[PDB]
Amino acid sequence: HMVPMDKTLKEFGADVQWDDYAQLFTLIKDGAYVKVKPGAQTAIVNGQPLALQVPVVMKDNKAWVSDTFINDVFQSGLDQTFQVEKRPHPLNALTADEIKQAVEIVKASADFKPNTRFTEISLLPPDKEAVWAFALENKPVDQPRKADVIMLDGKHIIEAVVDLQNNKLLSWQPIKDAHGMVLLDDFASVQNIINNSEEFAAAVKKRGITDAKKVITTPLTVGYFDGKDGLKQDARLLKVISYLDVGDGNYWAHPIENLVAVVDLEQKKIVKIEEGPVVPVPMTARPFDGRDRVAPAVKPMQIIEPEGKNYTITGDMIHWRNWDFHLSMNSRVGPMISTVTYNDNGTKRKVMYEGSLGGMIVPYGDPDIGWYFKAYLDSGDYGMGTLTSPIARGKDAPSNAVLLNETIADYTGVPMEIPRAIAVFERYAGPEYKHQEMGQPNVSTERRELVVRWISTVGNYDYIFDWIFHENGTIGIDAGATGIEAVKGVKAKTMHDETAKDDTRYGTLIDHNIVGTTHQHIYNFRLDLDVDGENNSLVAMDPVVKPNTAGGPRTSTMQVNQYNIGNEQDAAQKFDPGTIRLLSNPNKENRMGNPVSYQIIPYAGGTHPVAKGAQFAPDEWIYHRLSFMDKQLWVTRYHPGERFPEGKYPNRSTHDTGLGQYSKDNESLDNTDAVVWMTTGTTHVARAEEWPIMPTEWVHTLLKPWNFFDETPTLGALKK
Amino acid sequence: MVPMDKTLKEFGADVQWDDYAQLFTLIKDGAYVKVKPGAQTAIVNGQPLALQVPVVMKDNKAWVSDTFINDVFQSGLDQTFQVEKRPHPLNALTADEIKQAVEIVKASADFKPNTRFTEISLLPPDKEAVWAFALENKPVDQPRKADVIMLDGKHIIEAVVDLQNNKLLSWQPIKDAHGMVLLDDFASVQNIINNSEEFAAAVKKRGITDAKKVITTPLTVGYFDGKDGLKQDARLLKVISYLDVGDGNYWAHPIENLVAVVDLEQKKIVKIEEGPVVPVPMTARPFDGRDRVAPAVKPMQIIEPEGKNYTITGDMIHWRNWDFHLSMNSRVGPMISTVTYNDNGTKRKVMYEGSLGGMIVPYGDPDIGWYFKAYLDSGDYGMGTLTSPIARGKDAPSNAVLLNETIADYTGVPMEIPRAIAVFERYAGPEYKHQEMGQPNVSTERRELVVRWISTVGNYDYIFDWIFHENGTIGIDAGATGIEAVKGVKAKTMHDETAKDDTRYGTLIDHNIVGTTHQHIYNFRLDLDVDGENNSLVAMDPVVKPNTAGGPRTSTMQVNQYNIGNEQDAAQKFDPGTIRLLSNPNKENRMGNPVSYQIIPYAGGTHPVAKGAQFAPDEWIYHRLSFMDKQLWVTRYHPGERFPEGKYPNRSTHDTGLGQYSKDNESLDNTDAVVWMTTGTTHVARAEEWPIMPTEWVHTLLKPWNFFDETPTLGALK
């Protein structure tokens, strides 16, 4: 027997194109570009012939293939994008087996309790020195694979370390005062507690809502206000904001304003209900999925690489042109880019040991009851890797992308495979360089960039992060924000109504009775650059206008003030895009005697107004708990346990355990292992064009080689 | 028959043969053709076409009829280009109108024998009549007219001709204006240096044994109130020299501290400045690949097999909800005009005319061969004239459509620039996306239409992209590549004795070579008409204010909004943390908010950013060019105010540009406004940029702000 071609291929996820004139099918899936003619005994995979025992069969207008067609063709070996890893990289994430094993090891200890949940189960990293010797010298790492197991016993955090090689528990440590992040089952518990609440149903009814079963709740962290919010610092609490499900697929458009419930997760009950004035729920249907729109006609546009890709993925290692790097996934911060080297005429030079999102914060600026405490720490409090959004092929990434699946542990400790978790794609990016000398033949080369894209959705917002490898050594990091705006229900329908002015004091009126409350998106990236070695120094170069003292007609000249930034505290600063900040290697120079360096640009542009810092007065607590938000550049000494800008346990934290802590000792940054932290973000003032769904807005950052090379990096191999 | 590959490649089409499918895929601009040897039909943009003569395979070479190209590419099946039956009134002068305008002024008794033409361009009907043609199809009823600026020796004269009636309407000598640099000026300079015994002697002293290998470069001298010792009435050019050593890159061999001043009317060197002798850097530094081998790469193609989503009628581009006119000017390049956004069936005004306003590349070295260096690329050299034909597939993506444009050369003869502008649609990530937990995903792709133009002036190559986003946003990006202007120095490494003095004004990028610090300042003139002529400039500053509503918060996020009423207050520094809108106070969206466009002069860049001019306020270049120190400018619309640096910037003594246009400080309240955006970079060099510089880009944005009533890309309601 055989199966229907279209059905099967689509299910498999391949794009299927039929050309009636040529009597040819073109099948595309990740790195495979296939051509097959009905009745032919051979097919073409990435330009190479593949024999087929069973030919594609055309019947009454239906194509049919053998039940082994998909594996014989796509897994043939002619698509060489993916290769088998021989010597397993020491930074490879925990496999599903290793995750299951870490879990049995802790469950075997006398303390595990039934309700014990897992906030994070991830590899405990081998020492960095041994990881680089493996990457560069191929030296085996002789330290045993270990896993960090962070548990939530009810509301108490315990840190456990297991030895996977020797299958034994190495430590089990209770962490006092820390609160755990919000876990998936907490969302279900909140909805259920609200649904069983007699008082909440009553509160809801007096605000116009008849069927309380149509109320959608959302769980938010409460932060810390030293008790002014009247909440016990000890309790595991979440605040709940509600909306009305009107059947348009967008409950976000029907807020129930001024009604907040405080839920105690251990007690499984509403412990408080804050209520303000009654504002009629905005009821108009506002779908964003197209159900009420016409679908325009558009002509096809495909980006094709008919002979395969220029990069190769061996296990989790990506090789592309002069770049080599390891890519893995973490449940909290998402993708981690490691052991990044640049092949310089045969020698692999170190560039970055570990790069990843550090953390982010989304603080609002309305003082009202349903808004004052809102300051989402998306990755730390919700787990962005866990909330990864599978890539919609051809839409969220170009038609020529390769989509990778990634495995992480779910909160119950069971392996979870995220399909299409990350997209890898090469892209044309204009001319790399060009010179059209008058009267001579032109000189132009195309620029190509390798993009590593990941998207994570947390509640109403969808974030997109791109790690861009330029063929010339430059590295870019862009963040895009899209999704549905968190909105405030208000009485004005227009700016002409009487309550308009007060309703829009903290946000723009983007629809009738709807205000897009002003807020900022602040992203922080932790980048452990090792500029051609571990020992580096921070150097400043500020372009300045100085009086001319050389004679001639000019009164001024353009010079530069160069100085080293010696310690962590002076390295924590605002970034003036008119200046230059370099991470240099004082032990190595280029051909002209200049220290090989990388220029750090925390601010390379953006499509929304830029956040110059956090928009909070200095006496606010969110301001105090999170310093990372106010400076764009920070440089700290390498410490394997300093990974988050907001701190390891930010939920209801009372003091900075993040960048403020990592730099408080003000250590020396002279000729030593440094870690760069770039903070960038936007200040979002809404507009009608962003409702019901917001157009993606992007922020850009860059890392450029500065005298790291001796000449134009992509000129090509020397002939003599 | 005729040989296919030969014929096709001569035609400029791409030919691909797929032996497995026995199918040829032919691509050229908007045409995507498929044809099999012996088939009685072919496919052109997904539609069947009957052939009079099948393609024939002989000795493994295909052959096609002598009529193939025409019957297939010109079949009508490629709908990319449509006939323009009623010409838009801003259509550039055609080759015939250029020859006619030239005959009208040559018929006058005031025309002198060796007169040159700095510019021959359309003198357009008034703005109101042009908008009525675009929105109402109302015929403009004026004869076609041309402005014809001549250079008689060193004397500028402005004439106006009526092409229809074939008569001269005006002839006006322009006192004190100096003409721009014309192409023949480049050869006189070289000839004049070649025949000068004094210069050859100066050169010999500097180590050059064969003066014939000396390559000159002509530069405008600027103005220093006489401190440079130069006469103001003289047509002068300064000359910087390099040594040709056969590497195809004379820029890599500067002859430092040797500058000659040439008087173009006397045809002679009228002054020579000599400084310390620095041996010429000699090592071959080719940038053309003669000494390199590129690594092999797998192919990548961007295809649109059914044709494009845009249509080009004459110079009118229609794409999705956008409609605009594209024309070429010899001084500033492309002009985007009568731009409207089709909002559910009704065309709304967005921009009457947009184009590069002017640009400048000022240096920061005080030395003899550098202190006066300040290139006004479009104003002094003519960027349109110097357009660089697009290298298909490399300077623009493989799915672009390349347009030819015509302008007049300095002798008044029409010149057709091949592949002068690239038009292409591109995928630009997701337009929007929302993945609600446990629900079906919602994602749409973003498409941008790019209009790209490249111009090369001396050593620098500039790329400009005008980006139409489907959602209403318009981006304007400027990329810079080419060869760096370098200074010869003695230091070979930073360990050498003179290294510190040698790098005071620039980075040592090669042995004995310093890339001198300088800035790149671009200015865009944008005659935005936000849903109408009458607009106002509104500021919105996000600020932190004390909370007065109760609750735990000590502060709130609010906005300080206020109108900017006059030209002087509108000339300002741009803080990327604030919002600046051009609003139409007479129209509002569904929520009662004035329809507007948010202006963003600085949306990013890859090189350090210029916050203003890196010049002390008493520098002459600073006084002549106020545009360089403010990122946003708004002035009242005036047909003759088009260049930020002024109409005649060569050796200008005062600001005749934006400084003059705003001088009067007029009202900007509910009136026709013109926005000018200044954006720039501060370039401190590195070794990664030598011998050839990796393209660096700067980005600007114009975004609809409550111009619409909801997400513009959702679609029409069923």
Ligand SMILES: [Ca+2]
């Ligand atoms: Ca530290």
Ligand SMILES: [Ca+2]
């Ligand atoms: Ca480091």
Ligand SMILES: [Ca+2]
């Ligand atoms: Ca206007």
Ligand SMILES: [Ca+2]
């Ligand atoms: Ca004026």
Ligand SMILES: [Cu+2]
């Ligand atoms: Cu936002």
Ligand SMILES: [Cu+2]
């Ligand atoms: Cu430059």
